[PDB]
Amino acid sequence: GPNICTTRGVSSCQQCLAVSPMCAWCSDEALPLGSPRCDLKENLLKDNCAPESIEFPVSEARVLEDRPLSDKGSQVTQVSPQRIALRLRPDDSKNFSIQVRQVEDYPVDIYYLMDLSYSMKDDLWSIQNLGTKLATQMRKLTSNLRIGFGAFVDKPVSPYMYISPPEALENPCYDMKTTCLPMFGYKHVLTLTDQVTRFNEEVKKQSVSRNRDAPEGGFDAIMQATVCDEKIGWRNDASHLLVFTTDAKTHIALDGRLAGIVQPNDGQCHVGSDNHYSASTTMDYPSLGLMTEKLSQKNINLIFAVTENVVNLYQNYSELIPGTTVGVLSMDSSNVLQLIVDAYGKIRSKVELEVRDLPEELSLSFNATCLNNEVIPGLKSCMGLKIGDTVSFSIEAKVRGCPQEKEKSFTIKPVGFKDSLIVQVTFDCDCACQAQAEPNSHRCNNGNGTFECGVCRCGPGWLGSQCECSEEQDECSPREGQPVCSQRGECLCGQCVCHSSDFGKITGKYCECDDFSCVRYKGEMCSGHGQCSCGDCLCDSDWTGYYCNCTTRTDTCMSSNGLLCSGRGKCECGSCVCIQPGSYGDTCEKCPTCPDACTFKKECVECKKFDRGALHDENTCNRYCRDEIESVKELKDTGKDAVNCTYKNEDDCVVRFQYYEDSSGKSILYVVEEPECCKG
Template sequence: MRDQWYITLVVTFFLKISFAQEEVKASNPCYGIKTCGLCIATAAECAWCSDESFDKINRQRCDLYVNLNDTCTRTNLFYPSNELTNQKDEPVRDGTGEHDAIQIQPQQVYIKIRPNTPHTFKLKFRQAENYPVDLYYLMDLSNSMEDDKDKLASLGNLIAQNMQAITKNFRLGFGSFVDKVVMPYVSTVKEKLESPCRNCEAPYSFKNQLPLDKDTSKFETYVRRANISGNLDAPEGGFDAIMQTIICQQIGWRNVSRKLLVYSTDAGFHIAGDGKLGGIVKPNDGYCHLSPAGKYTEAENQDYPSISQIAMKVREKNINVIFAVTDDQVPVYRKLSQYIEGSEAELLANDSSNIVEVIRRNYEKITSKVELSTQYTENITVSFKSSCKGRTLTDTSSCEGLAIGDNVTFDVTVSVTQCAPEASKKIRAFSIYPVGLGEKLDITLEINCECECEKPEFDVEKSPQCNGNGTFECGQCTCDEGRYGKKCECDGSETTSDESLKKCINPNDTVPVVCSGRGECICGVCECFPREKHSAQRFSGPFCECNDYSCSYHNDLLCGGQGMCKCGVCQCNDNFKGDACECPTSTNFCKAANGEICNGVGECKCGSCVCNASLSYRGPTCEECPTCPGKCDENKACALCVAFQTGPYSKEECDEKCKHVKPVTKIDEDEVNKNNLKNLCQYEDDEDDCVFFFTYEYGPGNEVEIEVQQTKVCPESVNILAIVLGTIGGIVLVGLILLLIWKLFTTIHDRREFAKFEKETQNAKWDTGENPIYQQATSTFKNPMYAGKN
């Protein structure tokens, strides 16, 4: 009996310790970490104490820094912080004759960083004046682009003038393309190979006509000198030309410049795989193959590049591609630009007359925006924040609306989540760059995964502190093979003896398993495993039989946040119950406005109402009933039969169903409005069109009490005779008035006419004694030839 009591006491003791430890682990990610390097890599808050005394007081060497700061000797406390060193930090500046422009600061940094400890630093960007610009015009010179070529030649100087107004450090180049010189892209008939069309040059894939040159006057000459050519199918071999333009040194791209590639065409493009139509199966290798004369030499041997190859090279060389295409091709190239970083698709006039405006507008769009991107950041997290030109700091890697001279500052946060197992990968290099620019910030990242005390020169092998059976490092023993315990005091061979294993087997298990299969038996005591690799959460209990993290969840919280998980079962706080402590024991949330639980038409389960499915009531407290008649509708018939002996109920039905209705002389509406318990109802009686009123309220026991006013409000009777006579009189009166108005106007008009007649009579010029129409009976004539001769 005494032995049984002793065993129970021991088990209870271990359980209490286990529960206490699990509570700590839930809020302390550092708990249970066994080495210094892994400790500082677990979380930013973790620190390691190498004091020997920690074994005596049974403290965890890996713990939160706030817990160790006052208890560990300062020299033995390992809590490394992130360190940043600027290796190249030239200030941003405009481009001058002596110095190139610098738009990003710093240029090189070295960061020593702990895993799971983000480090934030400032990156400055400034739009510089006279920043170098290289513009290469890549033109489709198939027969359909003849008028475009002539127009481009005449606009060459204008392009240069516009760009030189923006930057004095400007270079201009020109190249052309048609397609692969094989069937079915180009006719291989001998005459067509020499001249596929009238006044046409022999077909070719790509030709570098003019490398980038500061003498922009050459542009017009070389464009006019270039002849058009011809091909058979509609798509062109532009991807071959883009690839060679981007990667070939003969083009003349500068390392530090804003590189613009203007791609001009009126047709679509061939992509990887189309080469099979011409018997070309070798994939494009992504290398330069230009002859000394500037022609692409591998067009008939290698397939067209893929979109991903083009996108990769554009990103690698920091090229801004402007697809200047005709109206019917704009949708296709806009979709293409979505897959190529820093590219845009613009509408080109049929004769390329708007090319100057296209280049100027896109250059302003490109330079008015800065977007930061990263390279070689596998397993490294980089995030950006900036207020741009405003005041609110937001998560963004780009800023728009910038002008020359504007400064933008980004907060760059770098973090890693784990240590690389290979020592060679503990130092990483990556870069941050503005899209479309050759400048970048090179970052060397040293991942701090090892404490100083773990270096070989600090190890003490066969240390007396480890009973001569291990190496003493970082304040603790790393035991030799076959030895266990804090001081390597346990012989590993004992873990296989029956006596030692028996102490680690739960007597209640039907199938005996050492430490429930969740731990290791060391010196007769179970040392429980983590639930997952590198997890601070471990199994607990004297036989590792408990999992304090496997209880039910509610609202993504263990035990609903209203209890503790103990050995797989939620122990709920007061006022909560359920498997996940999801149910409040109180029914306060189920009370309806009338004070009833679930409005009397439902049941309160787990703190919420479950409404009766056979009824139409719904809502949190079963008070909503869209299809139910209201109390006014329910009691309308009773009000009519009790007060006026009318309505659908007979006298017997009225006496039976309407006992709760009481007639009153008058209902005071003001009193009803003041009394929140009373509700006023009013209806029109279909029999006499009069309005009647009644009120309802809930009495004791939630019974409805009705008061109906015994008098109705009826509309006043209408005097039909007065309306008819009035209407007739009005019509007659209006007629007389109109007749008088007509008579008045005719009288005035007659008088005016008579006065006019009299006035004309007085103005007559003839003598009233003579007849004005009288004529003599004889007439006299003279002979014009007779001049008075006898």
């Protein structure tokens, strides 16, 4: 029957394909004069079009490399498939899966970026034997391990450093009894080495210095630590933990103007044989974005080990910087050993995907599948995992129109890992019968048009099936009463020829279709997220709605909790719509008048254990309820680090338990073993 293919582009084979992914073209010269040449494949066949003459390419995704994932990190593969040859047609999409999986016992590197300003003097004393003690614990998590050390204060220049009296330049602790080192921006100390004992040897040789302002040049350190590959000695196939201990703020780009420094940070390594950041006094601090780029490229997981006073600051930095984690350091850094162990397990709890070098013409959509088979659309991240677990992501790649450049490529990659999936894209927009074209053909009125794919493409002036008439009586409208060519063209040779326009192109059998009359959002046609086609916006892969301004993403909708919009709340266009009565916030995380978890949400000893109540015939029993059911028996902490309570069970007995929050959020139950009943 009638469709988008027939009643639009019936001029050439290429236009036909550009109309829609479902349009096929028939080049058979024997085709009855009248039947639609551009139609669905099924319809062309029903008019006995020669199968080999049918032009109908289909988009595909051929897997080139498909090495299975490794079971033990002892070459290791953590991303499968590794390479895929994608091939798309005009305005068409294609989906494909990727499987990320963190191998167990993968090698680990640990560089220790340490603030060594005056307040961190006591921190050196408590770190004296870290390294060997760090090894002992790390040997459980990995078989291969190398560790290194770095140190930093701030840019050695006024007003960051004291410059009087002349003795102060030799010893910043001049007015104090003790004597400390001259000020340094950042110095490398110990290259990543297998000898853990040498770390301890070097830490005792270190000492602090002093400076004026509270903020520090830690981001200068972090930059150099990242970009100086060969000096630090990061392994290619290994986890890269960068431990950043500090007890104060950090300087950002544009702060250097106060020290007369404006030259922007170049993201280059400037630490020669003397192991000092030489450009400290001449170049500005790095910006947040420039540092984040290098962290990503070098697959570094930056750990913010900072004191409580300044935790919220660095936690807010970790929000912007992917692959990072924060750890509450004590004022003497006496708990750093455990902080790293916890950070490693936390960093590896999450698997986030990052796209790299994606061409403008392409757009991507993600659906995530984490633990169980709970598919979460619009998500490219899974959390609450353990080392060894495996997950998969469904990725869709749509193209807009048809790019001139015939071949393009990009890389989907997990954050902080070397392994990746390279996607080679190819655009198939041309018909095969174009190659066998025939210009100035005898078939088109003694060379007044090119004959390709069973049709005359007439040159300027002439129209018709063989380019007969030039200028000198047929239906140029749907009905008799309706006007001619929608007053947008001229019915010349029984065929609408549309007028030109300053805004774009006017097409169609009756010049009814436009290319620039679509709806605008903010001075942007289809919100700049879709191509205009006959008045209607065709949105890209990751945008929906009549305006193409509602994202498919649900990254911003999820919270630290685990589920989308904390508890209840429909995610819409990257923003939650809170349903739970009385709940509010960005992710519906805030709810003062919610019935406390220790009341209604006690179904974890009801739905699963001793099955009873709701969620029996509906798939949501252990969806919300998925906490750690630890069977501890009356610990000495009856209501302090959580929200404990008790209720009356089925047989009139008390049941004691506790779960709420320790630091940020810990969903771990502590229900008792044996109940205590009553006779009457």
